[PDB]
């Protein structure tokens, strides 16, 4: 008997949005759940998170520009480790500011 | 010297050459009544029985060994350059 596709199933996940900040980080760490676009027929900019996407784009502009500056100075980067440093905070906006 | 990147390429290529060389020389030294097709003679050694036959394979094996020794001298200097860098 050859191995077949492992058993997956549908799910109705009710969850209060406050705890969603924890749950999404946890589920990302797990790497075993697949979501979908439950609002397929909705604009990009009506989902009420797009402006946060603009914020993270601004963040990434600044981050990539400073990495380019580090390339200008020719300074090797540590890269010690700390791969699972994955919080879900709010104050981090100010620290990136 | 020796162009380090191409020097490591040469390390690999020359080690392969040395191994193939010693192997070919070994099968030449075997010369077990097999490779009569690789002896350039006409009505010279076909007489008297099997005379002056295995010698040519033995000399070819020695030539292979000498070629391997030269490539191994190059590989030794490549080891020296590896230790240099």
């Amino acid at each position: 008997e050859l191995f077949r596709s492992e058993e997956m199933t549908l799910a109705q996940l009710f969850l209060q949005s406050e705890a969603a900040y924890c749950c999404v980080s946890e589920l990302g760490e797990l790497g075993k759940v697949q979501f979908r676009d439950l609002n397929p027929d909705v604009n990009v900019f009506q989902r009420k998170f797009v402006n946060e996407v603009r914020r993270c784009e601004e963040m990434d502009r600044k981050l990539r520009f400073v990495e380019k500056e580090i390339r200008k100075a020719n300074i090797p980067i540590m890269d010690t480790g700390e791969n699972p440093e994955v919080p879900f905070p709010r104050d981090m906006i100010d620290l990136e500011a | 010297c020796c162009g380090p990147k191409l020097a490591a390429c040469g390390i690999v290529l020359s080690a392969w050459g040395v191994i193939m060389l010693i192997m070919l020389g070994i099968f030449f030294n075997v010369h077990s009544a097999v490779l009569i097709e690789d002896v350039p003679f006409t009505e010279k050694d076909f007489e008297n029985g099997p005379q002056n036959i295995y010698n040519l394979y033995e000399q070819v094996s020695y030539n292979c060994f000498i070629a391997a020794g030269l490539y191994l001298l190059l590989g030794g200097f490549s080891f020296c350059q590896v230790r240099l860098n």
Binding site: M8, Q12, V24, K32, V33, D37, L38, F49, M92 | -
Partner: protein, 345 residues
């Protein structure tokens, strides 16, 4: 800067995940319609407990279970020793949900056939040596940049090359083809003693009558078959090409017939899982019957021709293969009736 990057980017991914949701009109919760593996659900709810622990709020995060017309995703676990082969399978797309995965059979049938094709002992050794270097520097290559994409794609299937090389070594052993040459591991297996003394032949040698043919009717010229693989006496002969023409094609068609029939056989197990005897009763059965009636008789013909008839029937005996074709004539020739047995017509 690097930890800043990892934090920011995983934050980006988190927010994108939130973007894929369903905001209720008034209810502050989000209702999802998502997938989930069944076997690891304990670890999933454990991660939900981790999430509740991170911010104590006593939010149960209830996940009900259902099943509808939705087609689910497809997964089958791989590991470091088999992932590249699954990648080869996935180069051609992916099959339906709950289809049998024939990957391990391919893991064996690809090195084996590639080796049968690639009948070289030494080159198999060299390819396996490349793979061994790569295996012993796995981590060092992972850390190193694959500035050359060719080395990258060679490394992505490293174990594949290793296994291919192993089987290539073995088929080179059987073919007695190590750098184009056959080894005299055992005797010549023919041992022609009476060649011109009791060979019914004179001494017209050297000058004239150079290349001469034997005849098995007189023994002493056949010291048995070679114990292992091809006879190394063919290394100093040229009609080996004719003999190998007779042999290798028959060998290949046998191998292909067997693998093909195995491939057809696996469909029945697909249907026994799906409980579809309609595609078996009118499907599998006539299929296998047709392939059998086509092929089994040929296979038996070859197996019988190998060991049925000796040198003392050659001038009347069946052709090497052509009589199998003479079957299709649908009318049997009364000249030179060389059959495998009585009434075989």
């Amino acid at each position: 800067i690097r930890v800043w990057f990892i934090k920011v980017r995983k934050m980006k991914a988190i927010y994108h995940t939130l973007n894929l949701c369903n905001i209720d009109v008034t209810q502050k919760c989000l209702i999802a319609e998502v997938w989930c593996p069944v076997t690891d659900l304990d670890s999933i709810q454990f991660a939900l407990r981790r999430g509740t622990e991170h911010s104590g709020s006593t939010v149960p995060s209830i996940l009900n279970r259902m099943q509808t017309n939705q087609t689910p995703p497809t997964y089958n676990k791989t590991n470091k020793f088999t992932h590249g082969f699954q990648n080869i399978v996935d180069a051609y797309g992916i099959g339906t949900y709950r289809e049998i995965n024939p990957a391990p059979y391919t893991v064996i049938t690809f090195p084996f056939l590639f080796a049968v094709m690639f009948g070289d002992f030494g080159h198999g050794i060299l390819m396996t040596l490349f793979a061994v270097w790569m295996v012993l520097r796995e981590s060092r290559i992972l850390s190193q940049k694959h500035e050359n994409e060719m080395f990258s794609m060679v490394f992505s299937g490293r174990y594949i090359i290793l296994l291919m090389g192993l089987f290539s070594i073995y088929t080179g052993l059987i073919y007695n083809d190590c750098f184009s040459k056959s080894l005299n591991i055992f005797g010549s297996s023919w041992s022609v003693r009476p060649m011109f003394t009791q060979g019914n032949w004179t001494e017209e040698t050297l000058l004239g009558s150079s290349v001469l043919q034997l005849n098995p009717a007189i023994p002493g010229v056949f010291g048995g078959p070679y114990p292992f693989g091809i006879d190394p006496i063919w290394n100093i002969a040229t009609n080996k090409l004719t003999f190998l023409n007779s042999f290798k094609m028959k060998m290949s068609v046998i191998l292909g017939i067997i693998h093909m029939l195995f491939g057809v056989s696996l469909s029945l197990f697909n249907h026994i899982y799906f409980k579809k005897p309609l595609n078996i009763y009118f499907g599998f059965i006539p299929e296998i019957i047709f392939m059998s009636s086509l092929f089994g008789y040929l296979v038996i013909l070859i197996f019988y021709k190998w060991t049925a008839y000796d040198a003392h029937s050659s001038r009347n005996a069946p052709s090497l293969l052509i009589h199998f074709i003479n079957m299709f004539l649908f009318s049997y020739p009364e000249s030179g009736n060389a059959m495998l047995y009585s009434g075989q017509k």
